[PDB]
Amino acid sequence: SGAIYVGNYRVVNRHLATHNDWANLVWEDSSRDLLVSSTTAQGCDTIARCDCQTGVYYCSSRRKHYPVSFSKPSLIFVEASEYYPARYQSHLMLAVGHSEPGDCGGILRCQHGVVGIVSTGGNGLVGFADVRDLLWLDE
Ligand SMILES: COc1ccccc1CCN1C[C@@H](C(N)=O)CC1=O
Numbered sequence: 001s002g003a004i005y006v007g008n009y010r011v012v013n014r015h016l017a018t019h020n021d022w023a024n025l026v027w028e029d030s031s032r033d034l035l036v037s038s039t040t041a042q043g044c045d046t047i048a049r050c051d052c053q054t055g056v057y058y059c060s061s062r063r064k065h066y067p068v069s070f071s072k073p074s075l076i077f078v079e080a081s082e083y084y085p086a087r088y089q090s091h092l093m094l095a096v097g098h099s100e101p102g103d104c105g106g107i108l109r110c111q112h113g114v115v116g117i118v119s120t121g122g123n124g125l126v127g128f129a130d131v132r133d134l135l136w137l138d139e
């Protein structure tokens, strides 16, 4: 689990969104595994606006933050899971790192701010849904 809190937005994995998220919906995209809802309180996270390919992510199944090198956002085939059939997910970045299903939502960040959230993984890989192109999160 986990979310990004920027301005009056809450960014979560679409597959982990709550009823309150759907009832206060701003935007959602199944192909990216992202959903954004509105919040009453202002958040403290800032979004990175950069082309970093190195950063640090939070892994809840280890209670640890790990430095990683990650690929550029792209269209990647993701195996069937409890939440989606096998399909191509867009704007996804891959790295070598530990992950388990409940690690989705952990933040990946660089020197500029939040880059994205854990969305996929298995067998010593972790994938992150990029948010750096979502310029409207800043206004
Ligand atoms: C960190 O995630 C994992 C790690 C190990 C094994 C599996 C996962 C997550 C599996 N997935 C992929 C998600 C998606 N399509 O974006 C939906 C889902 O349930």
Ligand SMILES: [Zn+2]
Binding pocket: 048, 049, 050, 051, 052, 110, 111, 112, 113
């Ligand atoms: Zn950066």
